[PDB]
Amino acid sequence: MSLLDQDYYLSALPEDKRAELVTLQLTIPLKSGDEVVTIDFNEDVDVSQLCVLLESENARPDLWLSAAKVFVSKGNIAGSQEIIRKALQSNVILDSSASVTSLFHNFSFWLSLMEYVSTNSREDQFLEYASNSLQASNSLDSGLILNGIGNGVLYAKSRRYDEALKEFDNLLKKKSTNILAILGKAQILYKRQKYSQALELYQKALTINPLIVPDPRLGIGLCFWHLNNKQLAEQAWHNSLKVHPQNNLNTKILICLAKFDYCFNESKDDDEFTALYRESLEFLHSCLKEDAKHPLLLMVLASYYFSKEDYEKVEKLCNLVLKENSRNAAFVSASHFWLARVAYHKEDYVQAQKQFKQAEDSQNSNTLAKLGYAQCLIARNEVGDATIYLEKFFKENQDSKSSEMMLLLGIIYSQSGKSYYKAIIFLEKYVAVCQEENYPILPEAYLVLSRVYENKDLNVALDYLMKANDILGDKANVYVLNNLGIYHFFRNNVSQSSDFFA
Amino acid sequence: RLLSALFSKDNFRYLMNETSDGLDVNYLRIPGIIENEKSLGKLFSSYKNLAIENLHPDDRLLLVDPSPVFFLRRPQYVSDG
């Protein structure tokens, strides 16, 4: 078949869009007349000398902005800002219309956006710089739709989603072929958790432009993850990596996470689990040979090293991530959770409970941190406190499928005795969730259910005891057999009772 | 081990929130959208020559609904004769 790569959509496009759009050499006419100069961006192009030459020759603003874009690709954000400023100082822009000055103001706006993005810090200062540049551009030329796109992006960064959505509605009124408007709308919808609504926009953008940056396939894979079709997500991410093999390590990280999830939830045997887990570790390490300080990779490796009893290195990585990415609360929550898990072996119940609470406060979506908090409450013999916390969490999250939480609730209520009905409900929910997940149902839940049903239904209790015995197999104990025999004796099953007693 | 099983169930669900770095959109990222002032319009009109057919078959497979039938005509107004 036809190879799926960047060259595929290169050949799909006409040769005008193939070579010219990716030229690393810029042709600049000279002020002397027909003389021109060609400077290759592969070589080390100096910003100051190039700007001085451009000002002397008074070249078209397109060349200035193209050089700025290339220096952006080089990462020279300061150099691109210098290019923009000296272009504003150039005679061409001063003698041109206000439209060119507005376009360069919007370019400086994009420069501020990239400076904020590349650092994820000083957000207010760069946002104010970008806002001032965008306001100047709009005042100089308000008819440019790029000013509206910049306004919408500014609203999105300040979480003014309604105004950005209105701006994208206006852009859709102007034209429905605007790819950037589609991307911004889909980003806002994903931020608003409208995964499917953003997914239609992702598909439309991908169909319109398969070579558009940012990659729509990243959002499509996120939606497939939200729609459980993670296999298609991985396939689309592989296609994106083929199209974008550079500066897209996040796709490889997502692929590694998907492989780890598949290994956890699909390995049919221990040997297959080991093979898949080691392959995922090798792929993660190969990605780490490019970047060795990525906080998410360290957090992921912390799980493996905690499973390897390397708690000291887990603490080192957690502290390093906390120092680097304290802005991200999710990393703080994960580090606190792992510190509490490490201290659990040390049984620092007060310290582990405090760490679990801090993890919950950092990121409330971390259910595991709350479950560890409840477990630590149990460790400190806080039966009532753990019960109250668990009831609060369940009543706030009645739709959450925390099977172990429901099992613990059932056990606590069985110990209480008076709340047997909630215990039955929670144990049945745990049984159903385990059956849906194809996970081994704990026979202890069956024993608790039989104990509860002793005073309600001997038939259901006996059936649950039989199910627990079938799960145990050779693990049947003396108490289970004695209770089965007593059940059959009460059922007048003399033969079965005698066999169970034997 | 109960918390380990809970982690395995959860895996890295809530850790994908930071991975949204691909959602950010910047104009300068595209190489050829800026080389001319109207390169945006040219590239928006460069893909009008392309369609779903020109998409790669594997990328077409990525277009999954979240075939024509012979008995559903498209309406007309002048007919023929």
Partner: peptide, 30 residues
């Protein structure tokens, strides 16, 4: 039988021991 075959140590809770049985050397900075 794949429904019963998949039930093994990691599902039973011996996942940590399995990871301990998998040894790998990283180029750790810390």
């Amino acid at each position: 039988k794949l429904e019963s075959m998949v039930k093994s140590n990691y599902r039973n809770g011996g996942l940590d021991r399995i990871i301990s049985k998998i040894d790998f050397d990283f180029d750790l900075e810390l």
